[PDB]
Amino acid sequence: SMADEATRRVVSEIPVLKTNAGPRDRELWVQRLKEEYQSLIRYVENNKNADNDWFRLESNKEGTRWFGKCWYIHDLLKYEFDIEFDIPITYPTTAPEIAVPELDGKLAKMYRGGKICLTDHFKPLWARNVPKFGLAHLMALGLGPWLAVEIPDLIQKGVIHHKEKC
């Protein structure tokens, strides 16, 4: 499969997750969060090594609410977006829905309320890999490819503009 190899090329250095638990699952959920943080931090360290440190995330105490920032570079200008998501009760079989609230209503591939609209490929890719993919994979395979199509279009249509903070 071209799809299987493309997926492997993106995720092969991201730690695989194991535990079948969502937010209501007590000690099993705490264990899943250890796998989620261990996978996220290795993905961040790999990104830094590759000059692609493109996001920061934190969570609430319970690990049910995630928020932070992602950066996208185009013609050497770095654009920053605030991101957030909830963990569904049926995680990790169900994938989270990433929101970029500032882009609500500013492009077609966005739902009402700021959730990014992904290709029909992400969801079945996630489903076929349950429960091995986690939040690092959501960023790598979900938000990452979405920004690489949509942010270039927002810049060319002048929908977003860059201003340097110095």
Annotated active-site residue 70? The verdict is: no
Resolution in Å, one decimal place: 1.6
The kind and range of the H/E element at 4 are helix 2-11
Active-site hit among 117, 127, 148, 149:
117
**9-15 contacts, C-beta under 8 A, 24 or more apart:** 10/140, 10/141, 10/144, 11/133, 11/137, 11/140, 11/141, 13/42, 13/46, 14/39, 14/42, 14/43, 14/46, 14/136, 14/137, 14/140, 15/39, 15/42, 15/136
Q: Which fold has domain 2-155?
A: Ubiquitin Conjugating Enzyme (3.10.110)
